[PDB]
Amino acid sequence: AINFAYDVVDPTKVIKSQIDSARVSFKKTRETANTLRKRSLLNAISYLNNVVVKKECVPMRRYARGCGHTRQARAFNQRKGRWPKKSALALLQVLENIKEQAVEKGLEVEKLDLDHVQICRAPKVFGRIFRAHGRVNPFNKSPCHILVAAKVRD
């Protein structure tokens, strides 16, 4: 029951969807979703399938220390790029669910646009490891919340 930080001016023609505490790493889904805003919904699903088959890359901007250079990141005027698998499959499941509510409410699929995309941190899940000389160190992981809203064009 995470609330949205989106301010809705028209209650009709706004579609929201949500996944809470997904089991994907936080720093990698933040890197993929930075360029999804102000796009058509049809261009987004075509773009995310090219990341899985390694034909388009993701430009690392915030957390980017130690990433290999490539030539596919010239489209963003960048010099770093990577292709995360598991982060793209979690975002693809959200965009299909938006497409199903549009045909149930009878809206037109081509006219939609992505408007509000934010993710945030989540409570941890703890773990363990056993190192040399008999010492024990933590081995925990960090999930995230995913929030996406779609709006029709004018």
Partner 1 sequence: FSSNYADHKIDLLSVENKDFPKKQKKVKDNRDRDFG
Residues lying near partner 1 in the complex (CB under 8 A): 16-24, 89-90, 93, 97, 125-128, 136, 143
- In DSSP notation, 74-120 reads GTTT-SB-B--SHHHHHHHHHHHHHHHHHHHTT--STTEEEEEEEEE
Asked if residues 80 and 69 have their Cβ atoms less than 8 Å apart, the reply is yes
Nearer to Mg ion, 11 or 66 (CB): 66
Nearer to RNA, 85 or 153 (CB): 85
Angle at 115 between CA 110 and CA 118, to 5 degrees: 135
Nearer to RNA, 68 or 106 (CB): 68
Least distance to RNA, CB of residue 125, Å: 7
Indicate whether 142 belongs to the interface with RNA (CB under 7 A): yes
Residues 17-46 within binding reach of RNA (CB under 7 A): 24-28, 30, 34, 37
Dihedrals phi, psi of 8, to nearest 5 degrees:
-95, 120
Indicate whether 16 belongs to the interface with RNA (CB under 7 A): no
